[PDB]
Amino acid sequence: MRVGERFTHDFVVPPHKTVRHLYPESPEFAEFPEVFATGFMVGLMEWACVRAMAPYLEPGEGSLGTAICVTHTAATPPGLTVTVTAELRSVEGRRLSWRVSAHDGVDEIGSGTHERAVIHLEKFNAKVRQKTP
Amino acid sequence: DGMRVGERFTHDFVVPPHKTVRHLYPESPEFAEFPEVFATGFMVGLMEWACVRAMAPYLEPGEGSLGTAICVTHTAATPPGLTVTVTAELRSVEGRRLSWRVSAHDGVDEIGSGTHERAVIHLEKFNAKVRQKTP
Numbered sequence: 001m002r003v004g005e006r007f008t009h010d011f012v013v014p015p016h017k018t019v020r021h022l023y024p025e026s027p028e029f030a031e032f033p034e035v036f037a038t039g040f041m042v043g044l045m046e047w048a049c050v051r052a053m054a055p056y057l058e059p060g061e062g063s064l065g066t067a068i069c070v071t072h073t074a075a076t077p078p079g080l081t082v083t084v085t086a087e088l089r090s091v092e093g094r095r096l097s098w099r100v101s102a103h104d105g106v107d108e109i110g111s112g113t114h115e116r117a118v119i120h121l122e123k124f125n126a127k128v129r130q131k132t133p
Numbered sequence: 134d135g136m137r138v139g140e141r142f143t144h145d146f147v148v149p150p151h152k153t154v155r156h157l158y159p160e161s162p163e164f165a166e167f168p169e170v171f172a173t174g175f176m177v178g179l180m181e182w183a184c185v186r187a188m189a190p191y192l193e194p195g196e197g198s199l200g201t202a203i204c205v206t207h208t209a210a211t212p213p214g215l216t217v218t219v220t221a222e223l224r225s226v227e228g229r230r231l232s233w234r235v236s237a238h239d240g241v242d243e244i245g246s247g248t249h250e251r252a253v254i255h256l257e258k259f260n261a262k263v264r265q266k267t268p
Contacts, residue, residue, distance in 0.1 A: 022178040028185050033260050038200045039178035043157040046173065050163055065173045069204035069247070075259075079268035106266050112204070124210070125168055131241045133214035 001096070005088040007052035011044055013104075015078045035075040036082065036109075042068050045100040045114050048086040053096065053116070062124070063116045066095070070112035076104040086114075094118045134191065136223055136231070142187035144219045146179055148211055148239075171211040171244075177203055180235040180249055183221040188231065188251070197256045201230070205247035211239040221249075229253040 015021075017040040019032040046065050053063060076082060082104050090097040094117050101111040150156075152175045154167040181200050188198060211217060217239050224232040229252050236246040 022175070023182060026182055028182060028189070032197065033256065033263055035199075035263060037178065038181065038203060039174035040157070042177055042203070043172065043174035047158060047161055047163060054163070062167070064210070065207055067206050068173055068177070071202045072200055075199065075263055077263050077267040080266070121168070128168060128170060128210050128212050131215070131239075132212035 001053065001056045001088065001091055003088055003090065005052065007048055007086045009048050009051065009084055011082045011084070013076055013078045013080050013082055018078065033075070035077060036104075038072045041072060041082070041102060041110060042070065044082060044084050045070065045086070045102065046116075048084040048100065049096075049098045049114055049116060052086055052088070052098075057118065060121055061118055062121045063096075063118050064124075065114065066117050067113065067115040070100065070110045070114070072110045074104070074107035074109045076107075076109055080104040080106065082109065089113075136188070136191050136226055138223055138225065140187075141220055141222045142183055144179070144183035144186060144221070146217045146219070148213045148215055148217055150213045153213065168210070169212060171213075171217065171239075173205075173207045173245075176207060176217070176237060176245055177205065179217060179219050180205070180221065180233075180237065181251075183219040183235070184231075184233050184249060184251060187221055187223070192253065195256055196253055197259070198231075198251045198253050199259075200249060201252050202248070202250040204249075205235065205245050207245040209239070209242035209244045211242075211244055215239040215241065217244065224248070 220236040
């Protein structure tokens with residue numbers, strides 16, 4: 001995997017990726033404006049990075065998000081297409097650092113950095129199995 | 134009043150099965166086989182929720198807020214059934230912009246921390262703007 005490697009993916013915002021859909025159990029969010037939630041944008045950023053690195057993972061391997069540092073500079077109603085671009089900026093063995101950026105066809109909506117660590121899936125699941133209630 | 138710098142709100146949440154990674158984007162084939170852990174996008178929303186709850190007594194009627202930045206590590210994984218405690222500490226207020234230090238632990242591990250910034254908005258003004266760009 002090479003530094004400068006870019007990947008791009010598009011996503012038409014559906015009604016069910018607004019703030020209130022992120023936490024339906026939240027009365028405090030229930031009457032927030034109908035805009036693409038930051039947490040959903042983060043997941044879209046993660047997803048772009050996961051797709052870009054998938055052809056470089058061995059079988060039995062996966063990855064986890066380890067950091068997210070982004071702005072969220074404009075709001076997006078449902079119906080717009082959000083284009084995320086992910087550019088690999090660093091590879092420190094198991095650790096990958098992406099510059100992530102997103103626009104909704106009208107505005108730049110956010111950018112910053114996302115980081116990921118490559119895991120062995122079997123060894124990781126055992127670790128979480130043993131802190132599960 | 135006005136909000137006081139250094140004041141803390143904490144906020145508890147039992148992670149249910151439906152706040153795992155494959156539940157953030159059910160439409161994602163690429164996520165459908167991820168381990169069953171609390172998604173970063175859900176932790177981020179939990180942190181916003183803590184900050185929103187802390188701010189609410191201080192907003193004028195018709196006022197709300199939007200997150201404008203998030204900068205957090207996510208350092209341990211959390212299966213469903215553990216309680217995530219989010220701590221939001223107010224760092225600064227500069228007119229409409231507030232800065233928060235956000236922190237989370239799942240009873241076993243510290244799971245993440247960093248910063249979150251929000252902006253106070255006039256809800257109906259903002260909605261009218263949002264419509265100007267709906268298709």
